[PDB]
Write a protein that binds this ligand. Structure first.
Ligand SMILES: O=C(O)c1ccncc1Nc1nn(CCN2CCC(F)(F)CC2)c2ccc(F)cc12
Ligand SMILES: [Mn+2]
Length: 296
């Protein structure tokens, strides 16, 4: 069965360290760039309100067939959901799948089952992911001073915070956050960012998001293993298309000498990915994440 990779670094900045995100990320870089990804827990009292327009939030998530590569056009037929109705679907799926309440399923069991399903020919599990929803559609999950929604006085600090993903620097010398509504086993395959950018990711609420990261010094190693083992039909494809289908069990990479680190990101925690750090992951259950690429 699946062997979990070693844990990536988790930082718990003091209020002083938490004052300036870019300065903090610059200070942790000597360790975090050797692991590709890191997790950042804000101070206990830092709790932004959730600011999306929940009444109107509606979307059609994309269908994900976990074993689609191993299996090598009308299978499912995706409903439109609200946040509430997607959550009911997601929780019913997971509690039915594991025969237990959703909060009682061990994170290690979901992880082992996910990778078993990805390689399974005998069982075809299909899930849905509300992925790549623009923050322009119904707003960011962070409060923003654009006069579209009311900001209470207690929330203004969060609208002005440098850790609000809307306030991260995005202009490179010579771009808004995206939202992800997850359910159990919804996933993202191995990729790096455009322009080898940093990215920052915040889990607003819900069950954890499980991550795998590879430090940039091993980017070429990972790409070589991919070419050796990815389907040939897709191996010859340019990277920006191959990255749509680069699903690979972390233990395969590890057997080929590629360093891989993991983490479970819980509600209210950040994950930072460093330049050219390949990353992949899946969701443990119903959750809501926001992500943006940023410039230093
Ligand atoms: O789901 C997450 O939490 C997540 C975290 C970090 N990075 C990416 C994440 N998800 C996804 N990102 N993109 C796209 C963005 N990025 C550029 C474009 C690319 F080349 F496809 C390669 C991924 C998807 C697309 C579909 C999907 F189901 C899922 C994602
Ligand atoms: Mn990414």
């Amino acid at each position: 069965e699946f062997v979990p990779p070693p844990e990536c670094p988790v930082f718990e900045p003091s209020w002083e360290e938490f004052t300036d995100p870019l300065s903090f990320i610059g200070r942790i870089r000597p360790l975090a760039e050797k692991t590709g990804i890191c997790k950042i827990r804000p101070p206990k009292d830092w709790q932004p309100p959730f600011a999306c327009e929940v009444k109107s939030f509606r979307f059609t998530p994309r269908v994900q067939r976990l074993n689609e590569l191993e299996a090598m056009g009308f299978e499912q037929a995706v409903r439109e959901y609200t946040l509430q109705s997607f959550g009911e679907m997601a929780d019913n799926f997971k509690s039915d799948y594991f025969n237990m309440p959703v909060h009682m399923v061990p994170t290690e069991l979901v992880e082992k089952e996910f990778w078993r399903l990805v390689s399974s020919i005998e069982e075809d599990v299909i899930v849905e992911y509300g992925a790549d929803i623009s923050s322009k559609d119904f707003g960011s999950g962070f409060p923003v001073k654009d006069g579209r929604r009311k900001i209470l006085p207690e929330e203004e600090e969060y609208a002005l915070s440098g850790w609000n993903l809307n306030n991260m620097p995005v202009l490179e010398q010579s771009k808004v956050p995206w939202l992800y509504v997850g359910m159990c086993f919804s996933s993202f395959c191995w990729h790096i960012e455009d322009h080898w950018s940093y990215s920052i990711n915040y889990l607003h609420w819900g069950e954890p998001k499980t991550w795998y990261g590879v430090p940039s010094h091993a980017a070429e190693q990972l790409e070589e293993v991919m070419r050796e083992l990815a389907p040939e039909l897709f191996e010859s494809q340019p990277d920006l298309l191959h990255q749509l289908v680069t699903i690979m069990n972390p233990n395969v990479l590890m057997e080929h000498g590629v360093p891989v680190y993991r983490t479970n990101q819980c509600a209210g925690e950040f994950v930072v990915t460093f330049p050219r750090a390949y990353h992949s992951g899946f969701n443990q259950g119903y959750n809501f994440a926001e992500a943006v690429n940023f410039c230093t």
